[model samples]
Target: GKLDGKVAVVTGGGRGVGRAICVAYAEEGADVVVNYAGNHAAANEVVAMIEKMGRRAVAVQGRVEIKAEAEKTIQTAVDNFGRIDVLVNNAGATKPAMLHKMWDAVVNIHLKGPFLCVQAAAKYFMEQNYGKIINVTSVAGGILSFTMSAARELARFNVTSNVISLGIVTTDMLKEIYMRRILLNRYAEPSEVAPAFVFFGCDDSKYITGQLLKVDGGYGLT
Candidate 1:
């Protein structure tokens, strides 16, 4: 088990890639704090699956944009599972207009949300002098992340910050037109992207920070 005895907080853990990451962590022997915006059912499902796997799990619901909830999400892990060792800022949607259909909503959730989550987690991470921060984004360019900038400063606290630039996964949001650019001629399963999150969440990625790893099935190769 790569993450035995460790604890992780994964935002948007209710479904899709987030859910896959949560289950993968549990499979690797880590307790999980599954953070969801509103879908308790999806989140709790992950909880049950993890617990049934002989690992501990809890579902915490909150939109990452809310400061108190962000703190609460990070705190819930320590409150029950122990010190937080991994934080996954995986919750967010597309940009304004075309897909997401909102303005500030997209920016605040994707930008402010990660900051709020990380700012809240900084207290425990700095005190323990260890933590892993995995920010989930995509190569599609409708969104961005604070990967290198976060890594530069957080490294002094012995915490690593990295980003995962994803390709098209088989989520409901997949637009048929995207398949044209995917060199693999297929979309990735959420489980296929889970291992990269697993890598960053565990000790193997401790020395690696400020990097963007793409788990996109060669989406841009075409």
Candidate 2:
């Protein structure tokens, strides 16, 4: 159990990669705070799975874009678990559209959502002098710079922050992207990428920070 007795807060922890990460953390002995924007049933199901693993789990409903909701997510974890050690900013949404059609929804959720969550977690992380922040992202432009910047700023507080540049996982939004764009010529299962999140969240990645690990099977290269 690499994360024995640790507590993790995972945004969008109800399904897909988020669910996989939560289950993996529970398997590794970490109690999890599962945050979801709308899927109450899915979130509770993940909580049941974690509890089945003999670890504590609670599902908190909130939209990360809202400041109060973002803070509430962290507070829920602190109230239930007493402290936070890891924050996995896994909540994301993508709508493929032309620039004219693409308004702020995608950017706000993918970027601003994590920004809000990090802001909420930073205070507690600084007080504890230990924290791990795993920001899950795709191979999209403009994100690497911000994630690296966050890594630099938070590193001083003993908060190791990193980004997982995901390849085409088995999701609807990625189906076309990986099919023709990946060197592996295939898509990855969510389970395949979950271990990387565990590494970043656990003590194993203590020495690693401000880095981006592509779990995309060379998709970025092709």
Candidate 3:
């Protein structure tokens, strides 16, 4: 209960990685806001679990790709919890098509979605002068993360923003992992990646920022 009274907002938290992360935060004593898009039932289950853990929880339904929804999600946490201490932008997606064949819709949701969420949260963190932001970046994003100018923009604010590059995960990432030759030869369980979220969201990572933490087992050594 070190986080005894903190407030956290986790986007795309209906199931899989996001749900696990939300549960981890709840266990740590943080009031959590589970943001979901299409899965109402999963989000509701997470809320119930949080309550069972003896912490307050709220579920906000919205599409993370839209800026307005992202803004509303953030405001929901602040309005209810008083202030947001941690934010996990965990909404992710990747199409198998080559860059040439990729649709703008795919690119916008994967790239712009997290970018806008970070921007909205940073606005609030800047005013507070103290906050933690964990952006769930993929292996694709990390190698090209520096190439993305948005990372540089986020560096200016006092907000400590970092990326969690995932690897073999046992949950919903099976299809992608099966196609790849991960060094671990398996996917990571939700329990494995959830801890890193706690580390970054907690004071343990107060001195780290603008960095990417890869959790893809030996698959991400490159």
Per-model TM values vs. the true structure? 0.87, 0.88, 0.83
Which stretches of candidate 1 lie above 4 Å from their native place? Answer: 93-109, 141-145, 171-177, 181-185
lDDT of predicted model 3 = 0.74
lDDT of 1 by residue, 1-222 (tens): 999989999999988888989999999999999999889999999999998998999999888788999999999999997799999988873222213222444444467788889999999999989999998765542233467777887898889998887656455344333545444456667888789999988989989998888765664665
How do all the candidates rank in terms of TM-score, highest first? 2, 1, 3
Off by over 4 Å in 3: 93-108, 141-157, 172-177, 180-185
Cα lDDT of model 3 by residue, 28-147, tens digit = 999999998888899999999999877899999878678899888899988998888888888663223311222444444576667667667777777776677777755433323622
lDDT of 2 by residue, 1-222 (tens): 999988999999999888989999999999999999999999999999988877889999999889999999999988988889999988873223311231344444468878888899989898888899888775543456667777889888888888887756455233444547455446667777789999999989888998889776665564
Question: Pairs clashing in candidate 1?
Answer: none
TM-score of 1: 0.87
Model 3 RMSD to the real structure? 3.8
- Residue 182, model 3: lDDT of 45
Error of 3 at 67 (Å): 1.3
